[PDB]
Amino acid sequence: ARQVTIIGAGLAGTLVARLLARNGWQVNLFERRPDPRIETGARGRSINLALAERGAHALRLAGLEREVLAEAVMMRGRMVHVPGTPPNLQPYGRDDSEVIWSINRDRLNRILLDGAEAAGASIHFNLGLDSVDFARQRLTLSNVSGERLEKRFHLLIGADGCNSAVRQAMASVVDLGEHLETQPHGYKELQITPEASAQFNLEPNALHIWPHGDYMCIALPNLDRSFTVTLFLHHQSPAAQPASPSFAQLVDGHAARRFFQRQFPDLSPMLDSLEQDFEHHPTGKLATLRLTTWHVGGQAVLLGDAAHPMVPFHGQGMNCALEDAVALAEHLQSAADNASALAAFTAQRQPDALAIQAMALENYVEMSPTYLLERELGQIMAQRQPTRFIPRYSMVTFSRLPYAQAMARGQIQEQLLKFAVANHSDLTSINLDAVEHEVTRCLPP
Ligand SMILES: Cc1cc2nc3c(=O)[nH]c(=O)nc-3n(C[C@H](O)[C@H](O)[C@H](O)COP(=O)(O)OP(=O)(O)OC[C@H]3O[C@@H](n4cnc5c(N)ncnc54)[C@H](O)[C@@H]3O)c2cc1C
Ligand SMILES: O=C(O)c1ccc(-c2cccc(Cl)c2Cl)o1
Ligand SMILES: [Ca+2]
C-alpha cells in the first residue's frame, strides 16, 4: 500500500484523502485546527460558499454529492440591487439544472472529514506543519503551544491553504518562481437574520449583489433563511482620491453603520448586528499568487489555494480546489511513479489555474447601451447554436470544460459580439445570419 501524508484537512485535502484512501493508499492527514466535529460551547460559524458544477462533479465522483446538496440552498439566479430600481433577478439558465448551491463551509468540511475517515484515512488534528526537511524526509509539526513532533514522510501533499506552510518549505529547496499580485480590497462578513430577510422579502433562492463600483456587497442564503453578507472594500483610501471609502475610514462599527446607511440604504435595515459584526469579525485579505512550479520531485506537491490563491469574485476557488483533488488522485493512482504523477498533474492543472485566476479578476469589473445590445445578441446566438455559443460565465459555472478552453472560447464570443454590435444602435439593424455563420466558423460544437 502506497503511503501519503496530507497537510490541511480543508476542502482539497479531505477530498484527496478520501479518493486515495478508497484506492488503498495509507493516508495520514494533519490539520492545525481542532476537529470541527467535536462539538464545543463555542459560537457557530456561518460562512457559506457557492458550489458549482465543477465542485459538484468532484463530490459526485467521491460519492458525497447527495449528502452535501441535502444541506444546500439552490440559487437560481443573480439578484442585483441598485437603489431606485426593484431587484432584477437574472436567471442563470432556462431551468433548475443550471443553478449554483449555497453551502455552509463548516458543514461541507464536516461531511468531507467523515468521508475521508469512512474511506480509511487517519486524520490528526491540532497539529500544524512548521517545517519540512526534504533531504531527510521528515517534517515537523506542533500544536498551538509549539510543542514539536517529527514525522517521516514519503509523499507530502500541501493542501494547507493560501498561506501554505508546505509552500513555504518548498520555496527553500526549489525556486517556485512566485509572483504575488496583491488585491486592494479587504472583506468583512456580516449577517442577516431569518426574521429580517423575511421582513424585507429577500429572495432565498438567489445570490444577491449590491454593486457600488470600487466596493460591493454580496449575500448568500442559508437553510434557515438567514444570509451571510460579505462587504468588499479597499483597505486604504488611495493617495489621489483620499476621500473615497475604505476600511481605514471606518474607525468603528458606528462609522460602518453610517457608511451602510448612505451607500447601501436598502441593505442597512437588514443588518441588525452590523456594528458588532464589523468590530468583532476580522477584515480579510485577498491576493492572486502564481507559481512557476507546484512540486518538488516526487516528494511534495501543492494543490488548491496552496498552489494558486485567487481573488474570490468568480466563486470558483473551492470548485477549482475540488477539481484539483480529483486530478491529483487520478494522476497518483495510475502513474509509473510519484515524480511522474506530480509533473503530469502540474502540467495539466497549471494552465487552467492561470485561466480562472485571470477570469476571477475580470469578473470583479464585469460586476461593478453597448452592453445590453451585446448581451441581447448573445442570447439570440445561444438560441440558434446552443452547442457552440455558450456564455463564458456558463462555461465556467455549469460545465467542466477546462478553464483555459472556457476563457479562449469566451474571448472569441466577446470579440464577435463587440464587433457585430459596433456601428449599430439596435438589433434589427444586425444581420443575424452573418453572426451565426461566424459562430459556426469560429466555435466548434
Ligand atoms: C471571501 C471569500 C469567499 C469565497 N467564496 C467562494 C465561493 O463562493 N465559492 C468557491 O468555490 N470558493 C470561494 N472562495 C474560495 C475558497 O474559500 C477557497 O478557494 C477554498 O477554501 C480552498 O480550499 P483548500 O482546501 O485549498 O484550502 P482551505 O479550505 O483553506 O483549507 C486549508 C486547510 O489547511 C489548514 N492549514 C493551514 N495551514 C496549516 C498548517 N501549517 N498545518 C496544517 N494545517 C494547516 C487550514 O486550517 C485548513 O483546514 C472564497 C474565498 C473567500 C476568501
Ligand atoms: O452570479 C454569480 O455566480 C456570482 C456573483 C458574485 C459571485 C461571488 C461568489 C462567491 C464569492 C464572491 Cl466574492 C462572489 Cl463576488 O458569484
Ligand atoms: Ca503549531
Sequence-ordered SSE layout with sheet pairings:
Layout: E1 3-7, H1 11-22, E2 26-30, E3 48-51, H2 53-61, H3 65-69, E4 72-75, E5 77-82, E6 85-91, E7 100-104, H4 105-118, E8 122-124, E9 128-133, E10 138-142, E11 148-152, E12 156-158, H5 165-173, E13 179-182, E14 185-192, H6 194-199, E15 207-212, E16 215-221, E17 227-234, H7 253-263, H8 274-280, E18 287-290, E19 295-296, E20 300-302, H9 317-334, H10 338-366, H11 370-384, H12 392-398, H13 403-421, H14 432-442
Parallel strand pairs: 1-2, 1-12, 2-8, 5-15, 12-20
Antiparallel strand pairs: 3-7, 4-7, 5-6, 9-10, 10-11, 13-18, 14-17, 15-16, 16-17, 19-20
Helix pairs in contact: 1-4, 1-9, 2-9, 7-8, 9-10, 10-13, 11-13, 11-14, 13-14
Bound molecules: flavin-adenine dinucleotide, 5-[2,3-bis(chloranyl)phenyl]furan-2-carboxylic acid (E0T) and calcium ion (CA).
The site of 5-[2,3-bis(chloranyl)phenyl]furan-2-carboxylic acid (E0T) has 10 residues, from strand 15.
PDB class: oxidoreductase
Keywords: Inhibitor, oxidoreductase
Assembly: monomeric
Structural notes for this entry:
Pfam families: FAD_binding_3. Catalyzes the hydroxylation of L-kynurenine (L-Kyn) to form 3-hydroxy-L-kynurenine (L-3OHKyn). Probably required for the synthesis of quinolinic acid and the siderophore quinolobactin. By secondary structure, this protein is of the alpha/beta class. The protein folds into two domains: 369 residues, FAD/NAD(P)-binding domain, CATH 3.50.50.60; 76 residues, no CATH class. Helix content is 39%, strand content 22%. The longest helix has 29 residues. The radius of gyration is 23 Å and the shape is globular. The two termini are 43 Å apart. It binds flavin-adenine dinucleotide, 5-[2,3-bis(chloranyl)phenyl]furan-2-carboxylic acid and calcium ion (CA). The site of calcium ion (CA) has 5 residues, from loops.
